[PDB]
Amino acid sequence: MGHHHHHHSHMKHSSRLEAHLTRDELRAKALHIPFPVEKIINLPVVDFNEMMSKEQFNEAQLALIRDIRRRGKNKVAAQNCRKRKLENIV
């Protein structure tokens, strides 16, 4: 409870298909993270705290979420695009 955001951050990225499957992507499958590598970076700590209020994250998972966000710091946020068959085991 406390919805506010004054900074203009509407960066549209619809046309996205990640052939950019890094080592962090292999590690995301290994730890079975409920969000993609890209979305860990695009969610700030304040907003991400809402996600950990629902689902607890283990010591290994938090270490990966820490490392990924420092590497690919750019905001290439994939928006609503009909869904897609992502190459993943779940």
List, as own/partner pairs, every contact residues 77-81 make where C-beta atoms lie below 8 angstroms and the sequence separation is at least 24, other chains included.
77/11, 77/13, 77/38, 77/39, 77/42, 78/13, 78/14, 78/16, 78/36, 78/38, 78/39, 79/12, 79/13, 79/14, 81/14, 81/15, 81/16
Determination technique for this entry: NMR
Which CA distances in Å does 83 have to 39, 71, 77, 79, 86?
Answer: 15, 26, 14, 10, 9
- Report the C-alpha gap between 87 and 30 in whole angstroms: 14
Check residue 86 and report its DSSP letter: -
Q: Provide the residue range defining the domain that includes 79.
A: 1-90
CATH for 38: 1.10.880.10
Query: What is the number of structural domains in the chain?
Result: 1
Cβ contact 43:51 at 8 Å: yes
Q: How many CB atoms lie within 10 A of CB 85?
A: 5
- Report the C-alpha gap between 51 and 12 in whole angstroms: 23
